[PDB]
Nucleic acid binder design. Sequence first.
RNA 1: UCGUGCCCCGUGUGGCGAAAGGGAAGCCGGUUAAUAUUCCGGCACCUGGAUGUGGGUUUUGCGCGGCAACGCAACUGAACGC
Lengths: 25, 76, 254, 52, 98, 92, 135, 29
Amino acid sequence: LVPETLLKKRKSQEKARAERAAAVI
Amino acid sequence: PQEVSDIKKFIEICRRKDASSARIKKNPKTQQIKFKVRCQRFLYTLVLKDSDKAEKLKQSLPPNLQIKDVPKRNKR
Amino acid sequence: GKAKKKGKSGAARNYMTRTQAVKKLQLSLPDFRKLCIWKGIYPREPRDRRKVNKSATASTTFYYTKDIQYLLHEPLLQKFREQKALEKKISRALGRGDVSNAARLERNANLPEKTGKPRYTLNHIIRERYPTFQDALRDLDDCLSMLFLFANLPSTTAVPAKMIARCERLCHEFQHYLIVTHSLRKSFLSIKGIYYQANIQGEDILWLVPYKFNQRIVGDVDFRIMGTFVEFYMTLLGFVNYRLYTSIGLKYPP
Amino acid sequence: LSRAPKYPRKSIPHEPRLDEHKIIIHPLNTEGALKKIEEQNTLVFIVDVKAN
Amino acid sequence: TYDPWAPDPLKKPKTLEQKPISLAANGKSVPAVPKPTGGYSYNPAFTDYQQRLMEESEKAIEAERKRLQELELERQKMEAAARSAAEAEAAEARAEKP
Amino acid sequence: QLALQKIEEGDDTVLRRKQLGKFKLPEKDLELVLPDELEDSLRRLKPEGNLLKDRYRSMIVRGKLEARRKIPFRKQAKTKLTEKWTFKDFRI
Amino acid sequence: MKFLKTSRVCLVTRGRYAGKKVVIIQPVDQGTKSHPYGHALVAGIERYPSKITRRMSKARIEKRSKIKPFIKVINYNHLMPTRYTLELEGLKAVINADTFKEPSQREEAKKTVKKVLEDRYNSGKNRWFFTPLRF
Amino acid sequence: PKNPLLEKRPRNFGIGQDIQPKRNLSRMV
RNA sequence: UCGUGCCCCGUGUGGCGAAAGGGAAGCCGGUUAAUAUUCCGGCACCUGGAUGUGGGUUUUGCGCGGCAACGCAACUGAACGC
């Protein structure tokens, strides 16, 4: 469990949730 | 009025904050001694055989609780 | 004397739920939330919510009965009813084809998209909420953070572009007062924004300004009630700016 | 809608009808009252019939 | 113009004077703008940045350990359910003066 | 012993266990520049977080309002469609 | 022939657990000294798991799938035998006569009965045993 | 995969079986 | 949040009418010229409200025992019903 990759992964899911929230007569 | 048969529970009742006063009734014909404590709801009575250590229970009762011996005549 | 009945006193009289408060004030939910934010009516928590309402859950919102009683006498209720009746008159005029009458009645609506100001006037509310200018200066942190944030947002139906321009104008006036009085003390460039600390009349005022970039409005925030906060805060900042300019002897508005 | 009158129906609010000077009239100087003073720490007063 | 600070209830209720509820764990009032620390700077000090990296790293490690533990517990739960279902199918197969 | 047991600014980072509204507030998003992402200038700075979300969370935490979720669709009134009498009585 | 055997599902008709469903762990047809009559050692459900809907969250499903068990010595006259059978290998000799003489053994036996019954319930089989009788 | 603990409980709305569902009684108001 | 609405339910209709019907809860002793289950002393009770302490329950989340009749100081329980 590399903490740098874990923090990168957490930032990735937080970011993805951020743009997901911001997005005949 | 309630009767207490446990010395420990009687000591806790006498150490309760609502214990206004206490009195000792001596019955020599029956040869018994009664400790009565006045609390808010109930008067609690502990009945003991009359004895020296039964008198000595006064030193185990709290000092701030006033203790009065019951007189022979309840004068109005 | 006569025997009391259960549930007629205590917490059941002290509290009411949001549904009971809305039915008591005879308002809609947006108007009730707007009035609660403007008047400072805060949610409360009973010790036992079953004693207040047997159908209450963990998400049930409670308020003070005396707070709702105070809200009963607020003059903005008549303003809400007058604006609703005026909108009905405008709809009647547009449906009958009286364009001049519709325009004349719409001039009485005082729309934010036309004036740049809030639809309802909160001047009497400002003095009630802040008994002293010191209290106003102490709430200026939240006021300045909210208004400096909203000065860089795109136009929405809740917050129109003219009202955003008024936010920017008020922030610029406050900055000009700080410049001419040299009240600014500290600044800090963080990863979230620029923090500013000033000292106005012995009160430390710290607020955060975003970097000039595109700001993201996410769905996890309640943007309309944020806009109600914005309206209250610009109403406060106008009077704060007027008092500061008059105290240092300058003409307001500049 | 609640009432929002254009004029008050009563111009002056009335004074409290039963204040303390009307509640307490005079004490009782009878021998039973004077006995109660020394025996029960109790005073006896003649008061208004409407006072509780 | 207009300047503040210079039967209807003209007196506010004391219920309004009561303080609002704080969601902080200690129950104290949270400031509107909390004072930032040196670790939140864009070009922070080495000690502050390394410290903040240490708390975030250990939080990431403990969170990953917890999620792996609960995933393993769930996997064991479904394995136990599958074993019980297989046993039930096998049982139905075998059944078919004082 | 009982007396001893009785004898023995807030922060946004840790919150109480009880909720105020429809849900308990989640943990804040990570506001930290990872060591690969550090830049040497203010121009290349990557701003983190969302200040509107920060103000909303500050409002909820200080307790001026409770946390509620967005309702994207509201339930419509149950109605039945029927033809008008004039269009029923039309004949040609 | 004899039907009050091991894995027989019965309904309790008297006592604190009246209306509950039990599985027979051990029949004692001849009786013992303490219980001089035909009886049985049974394990059963005291609190049934709650109903699960399609829109429930997984935490709520896990909370509502809980089972509170009990173990009991019960007379045959206080049992209603059912045609259903619950075969569980984990309940083989989970309780005996000496189990009820010590509180800790009863707790351990109830824990074993609990884990086996929740495994069988999460399997999806024998739904009649895990639904409560309505009377 | 769907949860095996989910069950269907259909209601028979015949005469004398179940409580009748709430229908549109607008013709008889 | 199409923010200025939606959902659920049916049972009707208010009041008066008993110091002998129904009904929450006070006893003993003493005391006055004349009142007393009302006053005084002692010892209690009922109803309603708020909120603590002790104790209880809970990591097998909402007690345990008895074959049973049931017991034990506690031992969650809204709508709708019996």
